[PDB]
From Swiss-Prot, chains A, B:
One of its GO terms (biological process) is L-histidine biosynthetic process. Its EC number is 1.5.1.5, 3.5.4.9. This is Bifunctional protein FolD. The gene is folD. It comes from the Bacteria. Coiled coil: none annotated. SUPFAM superfamilies: Aminoacid dehydrogenase-like, N-terminal domain (SSF53223), NAD(P)-binding Rossmann-fold domains (SSF51735). NCBIfam families: PRK14193.1. GO terms for cellular component: cytosol; extracellular region; plasma membrane. Belongs to the tetrahydrofolate dehydrogenase/cyclohydrolase family. Pathway: One-carbon metabolism; tetrahydrofolate interconversion. Homodimer. NADP(+) binds at G164, R165, G166, T191, V232. Pfam families: THF_DHG_CYH, THF_DHG_CYH_C.
Amino acid sequence: GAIMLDGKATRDEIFGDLKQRVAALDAAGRTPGLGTILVGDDPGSQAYVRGKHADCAKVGITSIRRDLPADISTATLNETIDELNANPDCTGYIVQLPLPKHLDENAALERVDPAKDADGLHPTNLGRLVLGTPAPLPCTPRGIVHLLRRYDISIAGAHVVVIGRGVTVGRPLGLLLTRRSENATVTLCHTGTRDLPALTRQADIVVAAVGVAHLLTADMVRPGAAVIDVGVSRTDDGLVGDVHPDVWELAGHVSPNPGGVGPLTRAFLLTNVVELAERR
Amino acid sequence: GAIMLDGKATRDEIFGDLKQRVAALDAAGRTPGLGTILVGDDPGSQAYVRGKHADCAKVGITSIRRDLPADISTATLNETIDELNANPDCTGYIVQLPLPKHLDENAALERVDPAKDADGLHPTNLGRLVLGTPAPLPCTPRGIVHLLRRYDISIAGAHVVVIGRGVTVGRPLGLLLTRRSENATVTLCHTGTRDLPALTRQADIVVAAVGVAHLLTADMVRPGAAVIDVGVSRTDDGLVGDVHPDVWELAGHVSPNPGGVGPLTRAFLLTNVVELAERR
């Protein structure tokens, strides 16, 4: 059956590399720092931000937190953004979503300096990705490409089918895989797609990032194909990925969910931060 | 033979709508204005800019000309960009390329305020397209989609094969087609694509935008499919398009080049400006 694409082991590898690279930056006079802006008290948001800072501590990146109440004014939000933008120990940062409804989410996200965009989701950087201007790249597409390369899976000339068009994964992933430096042929699929299986059956690589429980089945996959399980949805039976377990019987490689791309997403947030410090 | 996807009656429709919308803008004291920055002595550029301003006059958009000599400094170019950015009479503008080679073209384009980006090619606007934020859109992709729709060619659920990844055409086109407001399946192909004919033969719509003379031949197109011809290459025999004349025999629809998408591309520059003014 399929070879497991071990994301935790791959993440651990990256972490070891980052620790050395952070030690180097420490030695060079500037320890990198990741900032977070967290507004309000959503349990999941708090958990997500805690996790990012936990990861930071493991590799020696300083945690900078701006924890703000749910009832801050837009002026207060803007001041925080402007401070982190100007803070020399904040090498990059993220704004945890969702924001209180009284706050204009997109205006806040656009106010972030693209030069400190650790998530690689600032519209300016996403547009630079479209245009081929080197700039921060989004973490999940980065981790996907890395995981594939780590196992010597060809992407140049590959036919890749991406299922899903989320702005943090599927959408930017299509732009990433079609650059010259990657060079895949990419079929972009989603819920509007007719006869998904006819397309997935053609793919050397399928990336399932659509959030539909066990949507991709063995009957839909080319024997020996690489299958990347990214999407997660909430079921009566828990969180569940986009890939049916029967795929393991015919695919060449499968990344599990959990334990596949997820750890790599966090590894590339940290990588983005170290790279920004190294660019300097 | 195939039905010609002639763009002129559709351009005329757009111009009628825009003239009305501009009259509504004038009534509200918000007469839109298009600026152009033309640097130096390239005759083609001079004609292009004349054409844009003639189009403006047809729908009632004010023309703002910034004509600069070839030997300007970066500071002079910067002052001009800064001036148009701050000029209240200027709703949007374009920097006519190519610039003299001592000038940094990408720095100039990024210095353009995206709120005045009439081309829809500023990275922050292309990033907004990725993210789903309303903003100026690149004109050729908008033209392609509108031309198809006006000829009652289905977009939703269509399998579109896009050949080419130019940053102003094929690349943003993949993003546009894949919005829920379009909802097409898109295979992104390029010079790196193996077995192109196997892929193009599956398409309900083929977009030829690679700049490779007559790359798309009849054997490559499903009978009754729609073919959009955008790509042009310099031969000698002169300029030649991506689509072999033989595809007219069995395709359902083919756009001529010139005369197909072109008039709409030109009209959508004006639409961008009007939209900027309306969104205000």
